[PDB]
Swiss-Prot record, chain A:
Changing residue 39 to F: In strain: Omicron/BA.1. Residues 7-50 form a coiled coil. It comes from the Viruses. Subunit of the fusion protein that is processed upon entry into the host cell. Mediates fusion of the virion and cellular membranes by functioning as a class I viral fusion protein. Contains a viral fusion peptide that is unmasked after S2 cleavage. This cleavage can occur at the cell membrane by host TMPRSS2 or during endocytosis by host CSTL. In either case, this triggers an extensive and irreversible conformational change that leads to fusion of the viral envelope with the cellular cytoplasmic membrane, releasing viral genomic RNA into the host cell cytoplasm. This is Spike protein S2'. It comes from Severe acute respiratory syndrome coronavirus 2 (2019-nCoV).
Length: 50, 45
């Protein structure tokens, strides 16, 4: 814990990216969060809304 | 313009699918204008 600030910078960078990567897989009210799923079983207009 | 069966009138829109749209007349998915339809048993043939 001596290197408090620097280890917190590295923590924050990893934390930011894992946050940002988790968010790829959030729904946001779309039926899936993994894009090909939405394309897999919808008409193109309904798909483009989702 | 064309004639189709009265139940078939449903099919004609952008983004919609079915063998009329598939094999007879594709609309672009970003069409502009109007679709107009009515019966024609005088053309019933």
């Amino acid at each position: 814990s001596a290197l408090g600030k620097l280890q917190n910078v590295v923590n924050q960078n990893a934390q930011a990216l894992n946050t940002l990567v988790k968010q790829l897989s959030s729904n946001f009210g779309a039926i899936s969060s993994v894009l090909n799923d939405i394309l897999s079983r919808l008409d193109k207009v309904e798909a483009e809304v989702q | 313009s064309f004639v189709i069966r009265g139940d078939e009138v449903r099919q004609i829109a952008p983004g919609q699918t079915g063998k009329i749209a598939d094999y007879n007349y594709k609309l672009p998915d970003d069409f502009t204008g109007c679709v107009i339809a009515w019966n024609s048993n005088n053309l019933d043939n």
